[PDB]
Design a protein around this ligand. Structure first.
Ligand SMILES: [Zn+2]
Ligand SMILES: [Zn+2]
Ligand SMILES: [Zn+2]
Ligand SMILES: [Zn+2]
Lengths: 539, 681, 97, 119, 184, 83, 107, 93, 99
C-alpha cells in the first residue's frame, strides 16, 4: 500500500535479495541480473543461461562472465563430459561480493598496518594501492608499477613493496582456489576410490576408511598449498631486498579480515567483563595470535564430505585439540612488552592474564601463561549472542530467555515461580518473544488424545534456530537500506552525474547537505549493522 | 493530440498456475478487512463502514454503487479484500504436499538432505527436454523417497524424523504435524538421547508427574516454526522440491497463509431483504467475518494479556476455521461452538471447495453444463403432412421467440414492413437496435411508422420465428450422436411442438406425453453450421452401425403393407386420387401402363408404390435392389431366386419398378443395411 | 496409447493427459487443483472439452482450419516512389571526414 | 504495433506537399472542386509550407544538389537550407558546424546565388 | 517530416469489399492515424506508400477480413537544434509557447539561451531586449532543442488533463531570433 | 514451415464437408454485413439461402487454409476445390 | 546375457547396470519357456535401422517422442532387447481392414 | 429514480407480459437494463441479556396468547428504556 | 435463471453437450455456451496476468497493458473464486492473426 511498507521490495526475498542490488548498484545494467538467476537456480550451463534469463545470448554472457572473472564474482567450474567434448558449470564465488560489501572495513584492515606511517598521505597512498587492487582483484607488482609511473622510488610509492607479505595481502588464484569447495572435495575425492590397488573384492569399508584418510591427509596440503607459499615471497633481486614474486597476480584473503574484525568485538566482549587496563592488555595480546589463528577459516571440512554421529563429532574433536597444542607453539607462552603507552615493573603486571578468568580465556599450559584458542573460539561463539534482544526487545525478556537458556522444557508457573514478573507481563514478553522465534514450544497431551485446551505446554531454546534466525537481519535493513541509498540516487540523478562530472544554484547547495548527511546515515548505518551481522554467518 | 491506440485481437493460450505472494495479494485489494462484520448498524441496514462488506469492495443488491468501479451490478466485477492475521496460519489445501515440502529437508539447519552429484544427477535428469507431467510426478516421487531412508543431514550432523500427519482423520490434529527422533535403536546411543533425557531431567527433577504418564510425544512444528524454518530454506532445491523460483513463487514461503484474500462481494452476496426486514446471510461472509473475530482476539489478546494456555486453541480454532472455510475436513468433531452458533449442528457449513465439487454447481453441472437462453419447452404430436426436417413450432411461442438480424439492402423491404406489423401479429419483430448500439428498442413505447423509415444499413433488429428459420431440437435423455437434430421452421396454429414421424426413433420419441426442448442459433454462422451439417438430410444415418436410423415406424410401415399387399388392386380413379394423396397436389406424373387389362384395366399396389420412388419420366431416380423381408418363406429349393416362394420372397426391383413382394419393415423399415431409403440416399 | 493398459477412471485418466482443468471436469477437483498450482504447471489450452470453458474457438471440426479470403492483389503497385531526398544531399557528408 | 524502422528516410517537402495536392486532386481536391475529415490537416499541412514559398518549382530540386554536393553541410541543415532561411548571411551560418569558419567567401556566397535560382 | 518503415494490422470492414484494397487500407489507416499522434516517435499525417500486403486472415466472429502489413508513412520528426517560423499564443513571462497555425501550440520554448537583457510587461510583450517584442501569427524564427514524449495516461476510476504528449523546447541564442526583421 | 507450393498438394480434391460448413457460415455472415453478391440473385432474400444459391455457381472468393500438425500451412481456393 | 535359475536377489539388482559401453541381459527362465514371440496374439515386430527412423519421421513430418510407445522391460521389448529410443515397425495381422502395420518406440 | 439516456423520460413501466421482464419508459422505447438480477433458493454484555430479554418476554408474552406481533413491538421498547438505562436497578418482572 | 415458474431458460448438460462434438460443430458451441449464456468481457494484463477492470491491472499500477476481450462470465467467476482462495492461473496471450 503506497509502496512505503515496501512489501514487495520487502516481503519474499531472503538471501539473494542482498546480492542482486549488490551488483546492480555496484556493476548493474545487464551485468547484474545474471548473478541472481545463478544464485536462484544454482548449477548452470552457459547454453542453459539464455534459455531463461533472456540476457541477449553470448553477448552479455561472455561479457558479463569475464567481468565476473576479473573480479572473481562467480565460481568457475570447467570439465569434460563422459562421451567427450567439454562442459562448464558456474556457481557464485564463495559469497563473492562479500569481499566487496565489506569494502571500507578492509580500509580498516590497513589500520593494523597503519603503523610505521601515521597520519600520512602514505596512509592514503597505500590506501589507493589497496582499493585499486580490490577494484581490479588480482594484480601483479610488475603490472601494477607498470601502470603506475615509472622512474620513481620502488620503496616509496607505497613502501608496501616489502610489506606486500605481512599477514593478509593476497594469494594467487590456483585451480581449486576460486573453484567450488564441495566440488573440489569431489574432484580431490577421486584418486582414492578411483585408485584402488585391488585390495579385496568386497568390503569397501577397509578401502573406505583409508581412502577417506587418503582424501583427508592429501586435502591438508591441498588447501595449505595456497595458505602460504614462499616461492612467491622468495624474490630478492639485485640492488634490492627480498620481495614476493613480482610476476604473479595474487588476491586478498578475508582470513586476516575474519579474525581482525571479530577480535575487535572480542575486545568489546571482555571490554564489558574486564577492566580498561586489562582490556587493552588482552587487546594487544591479540596482535600476534591473529596471525595463524584459523578462526572462521574453520568450516573447511564442514561442507561436502560425509559427516557422522561418530566421525563428525569425533573428527571435529581434532579441531578442538589442534590449536591448543601444535599452533600453541605460535601462541602465547612468554611474551615481553609488546609496546606499552602498567609502566615501571612490567613482569608481575604480565600475570594480568590470570585476572582474565571467565567465562573464556584463562586456560594455559600448566605453569606458563597461555590463552585457550582451539576451544576458545567455540566457547566464545556460544557466548556472542546474549544481550541481542536487550533494549532491542525488553529488559526482562533477556533475564527470562537468559534463564530459558539454563533451564529447559518446564512451564509458566514454574517460570512465574523462578523469577519475577506477574502473568500480565511474563505472558506479554514471552508472547512478545515468540513473535520472533526463540521458543520452539513443546506441548504434551493432558486429559486428551491430541488436542489443545486439555493439554499442557513446555518451553525451550534450541540455539540452532537462535544462532540462525538472525540472518534475515541481513535481509532486514541491509539490502533494504542499500536500496534506500540507491532509491535516493534517481532523485538527484539529474544533478549527480552533472555535479560529479562538473568538478551552483541555491537549492542544489541545499540538497547537497541533505544527500551527503544522508550518506553519513546510510553507510555508517551499515557500519553499525554489518558489525552485528558479522557473527551469525560465521560459526 | 490523441496518441494512436493500437489494440490487437488476442486469444488465450495456456494458463500459468502458481501460488500468491504475500505481496501480490495485498498488493491488489483495497481494504484490510480489520473491523468485524457488525455492519456498524446505524441510520441504515448495514451502513458497514470498512468491515467484511464494503461498498468499495463490491456490491450485493442493486442499490448503492461500488465506489472503486461504480455502476452497481450493471458494472463492477468485484474486488478482493486482504487480511492481517496474527501469527501465521496453516493451510488445509496445500496440507499433504506441505508435508512433503517439509519432509525432504533437515529439520534443523534446513538444507536439502540429498546432496553432491546425485543432487546434480536428478537435476540434469529433470532438465532433459523430454520432461512429462508424469515425469514431474514420478521422477519427483523417486527423488522424494530418497529422503525417508537418509538418517542424518550433511552439514547439521543431526538426525531427522518423519512426519506422520499427527493423529488420524479427526480433523482436530489433521492440521497438526509430528516428526520425531526415530530409530533410537534402543542400544546404540545418539548423543541427542543423552541430550533429550537431559532435557526432561529438570521437570522430571521438578514436577515428576505427567512425564512418565504421557510420554514419547516427540515434537511438532508450529506453522510459525515452519514459517521462519522456510526462511533458511533457499534457492538450491527449488524444483528439486517441485517449484521453479523465478520471482513471485519466491520459494515455498507462499504455501502457508500469511494474509488472506477476501472474496469479492459479487461472488457471494447476502441474499437481499426480499419484502420485509429478513436479510439472508451467506456462509463465506459469515465464516470469514468470524475469522475477523478470532483474529482480533489473538491481536489484542497476545498484544498484552491472556496466556500461552488460552492461546493455542484460539490460534488452533483459527486454522481449523479457515480450513473449513475453504474445504471439508472434519464436520462435527465434538468441538463445542463459537460466536453466532445455537449448537444445533445444521450441516450447512461447507460449500466453498464443495462449491466446485459435485452435483449442480461449478464442478461440471453449471459451467460445463451451462443453462441456456433463447429456448422453449413443450410436448409432442404428429404431423405426417409436415415434411421431414421441419419442427412445426407453435406460433404462440414464436411471438416471444426472436432471432437477431442485421439489415441491409435485401433485408429492408421485408424488415421495414416486418416492423410495422409490430410485436403482436405474427410476421413481425419486437426489439430493434440502431447502429449506435445504445441498448435496444422494444416496440412498447410506440412509433415504427416514421421510425421504420429511418432504418440505416448498420441496423440490427430481432424477428419472430418465421418460415424457413433455423432450429435445433432436443430430447433430454440424450444417449448419443443422434440425441440432437436440427430442422427448418414452419409455423402452424394450436400450441405444441409438432414434427414428422420418421425422425422419431433418433429422438427415440414415443409421442405419448413426453417433452422436448427448442433452440435457435443466434449468429448466422451457427445456422449454416447446424442446418447444412447437423440437420437431418446429411445426418440421416446413425454413426454406430452406419444404418439409416430414420424410417417408417408403426403405421407407415404397416400402412404401406396394405397398399403393398399382393391381393390388392386399384382403379384408374382410385390410383389417381391415391397418387394425389401421396404427394399433395403439385407434382406432375406419367401413368405407367395398366397392370391387367381385359376385365377392366386394373393396377397394382406394387405399381403405385413403385411410382412413389420414380414419379416421372423426368424424375431422376433409378434403383435396383433385392433383399430378404422377414417371415421369409422357403420356396422349393429348386427355384433359384428366392423371389418366387409360395408367398413373396426376396423383394426385388430392377429398373426402379417393384417386381415382387410385400415390403413391411425390411426394405423401408430401418433394421438392416439394405434399405429402399438407404439405397436411394 | 502410452505404455500399456489403463484408462477411464480417476487414476487411469490421470495418465498423460495434461489438461488439469478438464481433470477438474471429472472428479476430485480439489487436490487436483491445489496439486497443480503447487508444481507450477505450465499446462496449455488444448483439449476440446477444455476449450469451451475458456470459450474461445473449438480446436477441431469446424475449427479444424483457419480460413482466408482472396486478396486479389498485385505486388506491382507495391513499388515505392520518391524523388530521393536522400540521394541529393548525400555528397555533402562524403568528403573531409 | 511495433515500429520496425523509426528513423528511416529523412524527408523534407519538395514534391511531398505537391503529392499531397495530388492525392487531394484524387480526394476532394480542396475547396474549388465544386465546379472523412482527413482534409483538416491538409490545409494545416500546406498552409505555411505554401505561404513562405509565396512570401515554387520542380527541376530546382535537381538544380539544388548540383553545386551543393561539394559542401560540409552533411545531411542536416543541407536539407534545412532548402526552405527556412533562404541561404543568406548569418542565417545559413547560424546552424551547421563550421558553416563559415574554414570555408567562407564563395561557400556562403553561392548559397545566396543558388537560392536565387529558386527562392 | 521524415519517413519511416512501420508495421501494423488492419481490419477491413465488409462494406468496402466493392472498393479497391489499398483504398480501404488507406482509408482505414487514415481513420486510425490522420490527426492522431504515434507514441515515442512522432505524429503521422497520412501514410505515404505501402507494401508487403499478404493473404487476409480471418476470425470466426467478425467475418471482416484482417490484413497486417507494413509500409513507410508520412510522419513528423524535426531534429534538435533548429530555427523555424512560429509565434506566441498562450504564454507566460518566463519562456513562450511558440505556434505554427493549425498544427499545435504544444511547443513551449523556455528562456535560457534567450538573451539575458530583457524586460517583461503584462502588456503585449514577453521580454523586450536592449531588440524588442514579437507578435502572434507573425513569422518568428525560433530554435528548438529537446523533444519529450510523455504518454502518461493515468486513466483511472480515481481520475474519472495535461495532454502535451509531444513537447518541444528552445530559446533565442542569436540575433534575428524571436523577430525575423532583426535579421533579413 | 512456410507455405507449400501449388505444385505439391497432398489431400483430397473433395470438400472438407466442413468446407460446406464454415465456408457457408462465414459467407452468409459477410452478406449480413452487406458486401456485394456475385451471383444472379432472384427475388428471394436471407443471408444464408442466397449464399447456398451462389455456391453451386462456385463464385465464392474464399480460400481455405489447411494446417498440417507440423504447421506446414496450406491453401486451396474454394473454386479450385471440387464437390 | 544370462538368466536367473530360480531365485532372484535384488542384492545383485542393487547395481545391475555396471558397464555403459557394453550392456547386460538378465532373465528368469520361468517367464521364458515357449517364446512369446512365436505364440499367437503378439503380431510380428521388426527393429529398424536408426537411420530408417529419420526417414519414417520425415515421411509423416514428425519429430521424436510424440509416438506410440513401449514400456522399457516389456518382455517383447526385452525379447528384442530394446535400448532407449529404439523404434519398431509392427505388422498386426487380422482381417478387419486386413494386414497392416504401425510403429512404436522404447520409452 | 433514473431517467432515460435520451428521451429524458422519468416514468418506468416494466413489461412482464412476454416473460422478458424488461423495464422501459413510455417516453422512449429503450430499456435501461437487460435481464434484471434476482435472488435464488453471542458474547456481549448487552446482547446476551437481550436474548434473555426476548426469551423471558416471548415466553411470558404469549402465555396470554397476546399477538406474536405486539410482543416483537414491545421488545424494541425494552431496548428503548434499555438505552435510557431505565432497566438498571429494579426487578426485571 | 432456473426452470419454469420464476422464469424460463433451459438446461444443456454434459451428456447432451458432448453430442454436438460428434458433429464437429464449433460455432454451435461458440454461440451456445459463450455468447448467449454469459456474454462478458474481462480487462486483463499481459504482464502479471490477472483480471482487472477498466484502466488497471491493480497488482501493477498500469493503465496500459490491458487487453479488452471476451470470456464466459462463468469463467471469470471460476478464476476469482480460485484466486479468492490461494491459486493463480495467470494467463498467457498470443496474436490471433499473424499465423
Ligand atoms: Zn468496483
Ligand atoms: Zn541439516
Ligand atoms: Zn427514456
Ligand atoms: Zn499486470
Amino acid at each position: 500500500v503506497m509502496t512505503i511498507s515496501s512489501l514487495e521490495q520487502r516481503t519474499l526475498n531472503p538471501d539473494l535479495f542482498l546480492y542482486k542490488e549488490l551488483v546492480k548498484a555496484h556493476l548493474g545494467e545487464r551485468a547484474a541480473s545474471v548473478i541472481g538467476m545463478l544464485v536462484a537456480l544454482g548449477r548452470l550451463s552457459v547454453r542453459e543461461l539464455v534459455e531463461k534469463i533472456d540476457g541477449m545470448d553470448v553477448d552479455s554472457v561472455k561479457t558479463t562472465l569475464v567481468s565476473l572473472t576479473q573480479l572473481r564474482c562467480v565460481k568457475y567450474l570447467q570439465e569434460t563430459a563422459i562421451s567427450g567434448k567439454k562442459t562448464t558449470y558456474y556457481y557464485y564465488n564463495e559469497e563473492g561480493i562479500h569481499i566487496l560489501l565489506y569494502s571500507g572495513l578492509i580500509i580498516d584492515e590497513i589500520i593494523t598496518q597503519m603503523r610505521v606511517n601515521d597520519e600520512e598521505e602514505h596512509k592514503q597512498l597505500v590506501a589507493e594501492i589497496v582499493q585499486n587492487v580490490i577494484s581490479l582483484g588480482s594484480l601483479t607488482v610488475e603490472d601494477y608499477l607498470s601502470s603506475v609511473t615509472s622512474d620513481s622510488m620502488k620503496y616509496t610509492i607505497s613502501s608496501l613493496f616489502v610489506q606486500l607479505c605481512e599477514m593478509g595481502y593476497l594469494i594467487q588464484i590456483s585451480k581449486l582456489h576460486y573453484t567450488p569447495i564441495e566440488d573440489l572435495w569431489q574432484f580431490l575425492y577421486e584418486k582414492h576410490y578411483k585408485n584402488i590397488p585391488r585390495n579385496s573384492p568386497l568390503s569397501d569399508l577397509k578401502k573406505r576408511s583409508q581412502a577417506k584418510m587418503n582424501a583427508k591427509t592429501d586435502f591438508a596440503k591441498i588447501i595449505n598449498k595456497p595458505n602460504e607459499l614462499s616461492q612467491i615471497l622468495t624474490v630478492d633481486p639485485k640492488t634490492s631486498l627480498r620481495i614476493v614474486k613480482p610476476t604473479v597476480s595474487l588476491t586478498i584473503n578475508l582470513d586476516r579480515f575474519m579474525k581482525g574484525r571479530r577480535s575487535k568485538q572480542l575486545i568489546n566482549l571482555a571490554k564489558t567483563r574486564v577492566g580498561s587496563v586489562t582490556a587493552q592488555v588482552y587487546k594487544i595480546a591479540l596482535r600476534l595470535t591473529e596471525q595463524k589463528s584459523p578462526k572462521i577459516r574453520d568450516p573447511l571440512t564442514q561442507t561436502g564430505l560425509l559427516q557422522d554421529l561418530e566421525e563428525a563429532k569425533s573428527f571435529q574433536d581434532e579441531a578442538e585439540l589442534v590449536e591448543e597444542k601444535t599452533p600453541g607453539l605460535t601462541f602465547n607462552a612468554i611474551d615481553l612488552a609488546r609496546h606499552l603507552p602498567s609502566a615501571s615493573l612490567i613482569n608481575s603486571h604480565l600475570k594480568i592474564l590470570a585476572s582474565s578468568n571467565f567465562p573464556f580465556l584463562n586456560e594455559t599450559k600448566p605453569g606458563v601463561y597461555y590463552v585457550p584458542y582451539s576451544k576458545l573460539m567455540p566457547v566464545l561463539k556460544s557466548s556472542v549472542y546474549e544481550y541481542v534482544i536487550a533494549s532491542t526487545l525488553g529488559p526482562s525478556a533477556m533475564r527470562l530467555s537468559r534463564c530459558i537458556r539454563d533451564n529447559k522444557l518446564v512451564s509458566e508457573k514454574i517460570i512465574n515461580s523462578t523469577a519475577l514478573m506477574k502473568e500480565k507481563d511474563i505472558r506479554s514478553t514471552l508472547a512478545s518473544l515468540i513473535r520472533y522465534n526463540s521458543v520452539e514450544i513443546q506441548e504434551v497431551p493432558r486429559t486428551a488424545d491430541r488436542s489443545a485446551s486439555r493439554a499442557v505446554f513446555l518451553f525451550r531454546c534450541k540455539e540452532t534456530h537462535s544462532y540462525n534466525f538472525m540472518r534475515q537481519n541481513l535481509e532486514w535493513n541491509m539490502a533494504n537500506l542499500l536500496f534506500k541509498k540507491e532509491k535516493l540516487k534517481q532523485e538527484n540523478s539529474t544533478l549527480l552525474k552533472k555535479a560529479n562530472r562538473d568538478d551552483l544554484l541555491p537549492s542544489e547547495l541545499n540538497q547537497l547537505k541533505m544527500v551527503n548527511e544522508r550518506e553519513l546515515n546510510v553507510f555508517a548505518r551499515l557500519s553499525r549493522l554489518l558489525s552485528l551481522w558479522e557473527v551469525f554467518q560465521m560459526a | 493530440k490523441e496518441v494512436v491506440v493500437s489494440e490487437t485481437p488476442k486469444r488465450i493460450k495456456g494458463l500459468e498456475f502458481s501460488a500468491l505472494s504475500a505481496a501480490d495479494i495485498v498488493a491488489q485489494s483495497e481494504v484490510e478487512v480489520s473491523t468485524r462484520d457488525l455492519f456498524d448498524l446505524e441510520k441504515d441496514r448495514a451502513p458497514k463502514a470498512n468491515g467484511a462488506l464494503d461498498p468499495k469492495m463490491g456490491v450485493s443488491s442493486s442499490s448503492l454503487e461500488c465506489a472503486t468501479c461504480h455502476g452497481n451490478l450493471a458494472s463492477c466485477h468485484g474486488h478482493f479484500g486482504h487480511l492481517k492475521l496474527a501469527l501465521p496460519v496453516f493451510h488445509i489445501g496445500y496440507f499433504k504436499a506441505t508435508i512433503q515440502i517439509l519432509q525432504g529437508i533437515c529439520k534443523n539447519c534446513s538444507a536439502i538432505l540429498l546432496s553432491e552429484t546425485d543432487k546434480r544427477q536428478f537435476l540434469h535428469e529433470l532438465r532433459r527436454p523430454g520432461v512429462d507431467n508424469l515425469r514431474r510426478m514420478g521422477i519427483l516421487k523417486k527423488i522424494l523417497d530418497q529422503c525417508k531412508k537418509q538418517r542424518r543431514c550433511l552439514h547439521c550432523g543431526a538426525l531427522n524424523g518423519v512426519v506422520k500427519k499427527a493423529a488420524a482423520g479427526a480433523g482436530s490434529a489433521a492440521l497438526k504435524i509430528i516428526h520425531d527422533t526415530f530409530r533410537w535403536v534402543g542400544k546404540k546411543s545418539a548423543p541427542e538421547k543423552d541430550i533429550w533425557v537431559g532435557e526432561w531431567k529438570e521437570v522430571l527433577a521438578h514436577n515428576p508427574e505427567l512425564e512418565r504418564y504421557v510420554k514419547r510425544c516427540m515434537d511438532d512444528l508450529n506453522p510459525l516454526k515452519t514459517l521462519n524454518l522456510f526462511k533458511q530454506i533457499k534457492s538450491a532445491d527449488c524444483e528439486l522440491l517441485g517449484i521453479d523460483a523465478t520471482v513471485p513463487s519466491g520459494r515455498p514461503e507462499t504455501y502457508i497463509w500469511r494474509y488472506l484474500p477476501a472474496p469479492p462481494v459479487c461472488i457471494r452476496p447476502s441474499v437481499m431483504m426480499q419484502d420485509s426486514p429478513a436479510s439472508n446471510e451467506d456462509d463465506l461472509t459469515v465464516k470469514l467475518t468470524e475469522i475477523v473475530w478470532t483474529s482480533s482476539l489473538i491481536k489484542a489478546g497476545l498484544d498484552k494479556g491472556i496466556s500461552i494456555n488460552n492461546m493455542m486453541e484460539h490460534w488452533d480454532y483459527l486454522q481449523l476455521t479457515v480450513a473449513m472455510y475453504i474445504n471439508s475436513d472434519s464436520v462435527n468433531p465434538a468441538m463445542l461452538p463459537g460466536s453466532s452458533n445455537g449448537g444445533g449442528k445444521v450441516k450447512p457449513i461447507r460449500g466453498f471447495c464443495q462449491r466446485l465439487k459435485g452435483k449442480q454447481g461449478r464442478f461440471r453441472g453449471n459451467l460445463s453444463g451451462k443453462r441456456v437462453d433463447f429456448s422453449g419447452r413443450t410436448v409432442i404430436s404428429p404431423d405426417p403432412n409436415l415434411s421431414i426436417d421441419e419442427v412445426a413450432v407453435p406460433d404462440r411461442v414464436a411471438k416471444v421467440l426472436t432471432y437477431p438480424e442485421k439489415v441491409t439492402r435485401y433485408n429492408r423491404h421485408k424488415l421495414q414492413e416486418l416492423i410495422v406489423n409490430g410485436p403482436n401479429v405474427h410476421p413481425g419483430a419486437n426489439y430493434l437496435l440502431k447502429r449506435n448500439e445504445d441498448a435496444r428498442r422494444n416496440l412498447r413505447y410506440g412509433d415504427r411508422m416514421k421510425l421504420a423509415k429511418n432504418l440505416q444499413i448498420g441496423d440490427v433488429v430481432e424477428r419472430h420465428l418465421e418460415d424457413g428459420d433455423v432450429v435445433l431440437f432436443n430430447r433430454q435423455p440424450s444417449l448419443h450422436r443422434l440425441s440432437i437434430l436440427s430442422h427448418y421452421a414452419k409455423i402452424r396454429p394450436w400450441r405444441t411442438f409438432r414434427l414428422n414421424e420418421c425422425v422419431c426413433t433418433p429422438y427415440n420419441a414415443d409421442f405419448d406425453g413426453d417433452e422436448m426442448n427448442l433452440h435457435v442459433p443466434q449468429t448466422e454462422e451457427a445456422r449454416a453450421e447446424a442446418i447444412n451439417l447437423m440437420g437431418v438430410k446429411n445426418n440421416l444415418l446413425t454413426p454406430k452401425s452406419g444404418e439409416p436410423i430414420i424410417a417408417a415406424t408403426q403405421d407407415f410401415i404397416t400402412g404401406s403393407y396394405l397398399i403393398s399387399h399382393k391381393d390388392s388392386f386399384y382403379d384408374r380413379a382410385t390410383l389417381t386420387q391415391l397418387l394425389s394423396m401421396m404427394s399433395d397436389g403439385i407434382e406432375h406424373f406419367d401413368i405407367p401402363p395398366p397392370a391387367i387389362m381385359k376385365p377392366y384395366y386394373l393396377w397394382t399396389g406394387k405399381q403405385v408404390f413403385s411410382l412413389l420412388i420414380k414419379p416421372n419420366h423426368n424424375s431422376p431416380v433409378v434403383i435396383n435392389l433385392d433383399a430378404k423381408n422377414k417371415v421369409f418363406v422357403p420356396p422349393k429349393s429348386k427355384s433359384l431366386p428366392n423371389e418366387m416362394s409360395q408367398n413373396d420372397g426376396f423383394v426385388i426391383i430392377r429398373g426402379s419398378q417393384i417386381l415382387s413382394g410385400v415390403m413391411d419393415k425390411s426394405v423401408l423399415g430401418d433394421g438392416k443395411k439394405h434399405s429402399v431409403f438407404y439405397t436411394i440416399l | 496409447y502410452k505404455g500399456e493398459v489403463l484408462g477411464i477412471t480417476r487414476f487411469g485418466l490421470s495418465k498423460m493427459r495434461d489438461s488439469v482443468l478438464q481433470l477438474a471436469s471429472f472428479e476430485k477437483t480439489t487436490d487436483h487443483l491445489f496439486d497443480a498450482a503447487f508444481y507450477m504447471k505450465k499446462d496449455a489450452v488444448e483439449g476440446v472439452s477444455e476449450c469451451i470453458i475458456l470459450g474461445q474457438t473449438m480446436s477441431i471440426g469446424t475449427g479444424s482450419f483457419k480460413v482466408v479470403k482472396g486478396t486479389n492483389i498485385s505486388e506491382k503497385d507495391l513499388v515505392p516512389k520518391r524523388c530521393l531526398f536522400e540521394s541529393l544531399s548525400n555528397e555533402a557528408a562524403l568528403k573531409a571526414n | 504495433m511495433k515500429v520496425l524502422e523509426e528513423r528511416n528516410a529523412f524527408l523534407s517537402d519538395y514534391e511531398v506537399l505537391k503529392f499531397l495536392t495530388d492525392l487531394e486532386k484524387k480526394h476532394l481536391w480542396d475547396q474549388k472542386s465544386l465546379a472523412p475529415e482527413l482534409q483538416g490537416i491538409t490545409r494545416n499541412v500546406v498552409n505555411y509550407l505554401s505561404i513562405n514559398k509565396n512570401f515554387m518549382s520542380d527541376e530546382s530540386f535537381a538544380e539544388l544538389m548540383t553545386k551543393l554536393n561539394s559542401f560540409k553541410l552533411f545531411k542536416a541543415e543541407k536539407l534545412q537550407i532548402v526552405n527556412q532561411l533562404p541561404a543568406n548571411m548569418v542565417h545559413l551560418y547560424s546552424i551547421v558546424e563550421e558553416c563559415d569558419a574554414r570555408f567562407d567567401e564563395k561557400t556562403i556566397e553561392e548559397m545566396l546565388e543558388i537560392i536565387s535560382g529558386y527562392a | 517530416f521524415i519517413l519511416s518503415k512501420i508495421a501494423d494490422l488492419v481490419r477491413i470492414p465488409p462494406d468496402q469489399f466493392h472498393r479497391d484494397t489499398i483504398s480501404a487500407i488507406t482509408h482505414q489507416l487514415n481513420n486510425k492515424f490522420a490527426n492522431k499522434i504515434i507514441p515515442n516517435v512522432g505524429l503521422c499525417i497520412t501514410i505515404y506508400d505501402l507494401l508487403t500486403v499478404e493473404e487476409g486472415q480471418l476470425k470466426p466472429g467478425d467475418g471482416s477480413s484482417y490484413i497486417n502489413v507494413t509500409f513507410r508513412a508520412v510522419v513528423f520528426k524535426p531534429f534538435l537544434g533548429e530555427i523555424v517560423t512560429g509565434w506566441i499564443s498562450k504564454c507566460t513571462a518566463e519562456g513562450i509557447k511558440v505556434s505554427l497555425l493549425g498544427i499545435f501550440d504544444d511547443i513551449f520554448i523556455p528562456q535560457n539561451m534567450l538573451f539575458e537583457g530583457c524586460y517583461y510587461t503584462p502588456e503585449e510583450s514577453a521580454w523586450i531586449w536592449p531588440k524588442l517584442y514579437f507578435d502572434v501569427n507573425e513569422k518568428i524564427r525560433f530554435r528548438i532543442e529537446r523533444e519529450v514524449f510523455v504518454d502518461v495516461k493515468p486513466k483511472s476510476p480515481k481520475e474519472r488533463e495535461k495532454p502535451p504528449a509531444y513537447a518541444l523546447l528552445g530559446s533565442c541564442q542569436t540575433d534575428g531570433m524571436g523577430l525575423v526583421s532583426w535579421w533579413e | 514451415e512456410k507455405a507449400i507450393p501449388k505444385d505439391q498438394r497432398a489431400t483430397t480434391p473433395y470438400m472438407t464437408k466442413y468446407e460446406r460448413a464454415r465456408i457457408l457460415g462465414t459467407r452468409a455472415l459477410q452478406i449480413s454485413m452487406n458486401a456485394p453478391v456475385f451471383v444472379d440473385l432472384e427475388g428471394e432474400t436471407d443471408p444464408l439461402r442466397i449464399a447456398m444459391k451462389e455456391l453451386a455457381e462456385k463464385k465464392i472468393p474464399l480460400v481455405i487454409r489447411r494446417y498440417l500438425p507440423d504447421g506446414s500451412f496450406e491453401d486451396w481456393s474454394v473454386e479450385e476445390l471440387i464437390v | 546375457i544370462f538368466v536367473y535359475q530360480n531365485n532372484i536377489t535384488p542384492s545383485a539388482m542393487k547395481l545391475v547396470p555396471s558397464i555403459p559401453p557394453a550392456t547386460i541381459e538378465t532373465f528368469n527362465e520361468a517367464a521364458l519357456v515357449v517364446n512369446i514371440t512365436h505364440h499367437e496374439l503378439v503380431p510380428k515386430h521388426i527393429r529398424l535401422s536408426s537411420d530408417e527412423k529419420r526417414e519414417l519421421l520425415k515421411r509423416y513430418r514428425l519429430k521424436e517422442s510424440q509416438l506410440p510407445r513401449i514400456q522399457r522391460a516389456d518382455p517383447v521389448a526385452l525379447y528384442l532387447g530394446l535400448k532407449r529410443g529404439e523404434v519398431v515397425k509392427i505388422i498386426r495381422k487380422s482381417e478387419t481392414s486386413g494386414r497392416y502395420a504401425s510403429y512404436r518406440i522404447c520409452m | 429514480m433514473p431517467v432515460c439516456k435520451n428521451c429524458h423520460g422519468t416514468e418506468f413501466e416494466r413489461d412482464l407480459s412476454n416473460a422478458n421482464n424488461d423495464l422501459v419508459c413510455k417516453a422512449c422505447g429503450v430499456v435501461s437494463e437487460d435481464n434484471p438480477i434476482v435472488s435464488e433458493v453471542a458474547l456481549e454484555s448487552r446482547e446476551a441479556t437481550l436474548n434473555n430479554a426476548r426469551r423471558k418476554l416471548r415466553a411470558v408474552s404469549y402465555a396470554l396468547h397476546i399477538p406474536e406481533y405486539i410482543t416483537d413491538a414491545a421488545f424494541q421498547w425494552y431496548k428503548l428504556a434499555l438505552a435510557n438505562n431505565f432497566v438498571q436497578g429494579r426487578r426485571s418482572q | 435463471t432456473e426452470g419454469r415458474s420464476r422464469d424460463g431458460g433451459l438446461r444443456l448438460g454434459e451428456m447432451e453437450r458432448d453430442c454436438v462434438i460428434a458433429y464437429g460443430a464449433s460455432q454451435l458451441l461458440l454461440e451456445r455456451l459463450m455468447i448467449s449464456s454469459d456474454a462478458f468481457e474481462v480487462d486483463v494484463c499481459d504482464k502479471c496476468g490477472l483480471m482487472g477492470y477498466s484502466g488497471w491491472c491493480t497488482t501493477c499500477k498500469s493503465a496500459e497493458n490491458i487487453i479488452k476481450m471476451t470470456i464466459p462470465y462463468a469463467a471469470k467467476l471460476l478464476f476469482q473464486e480460485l484466486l479468492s482462495m490461494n491459486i493463480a492461473p495467470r494467463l498467457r496471450l498470443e496474436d490471433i492473426f499473424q499465423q
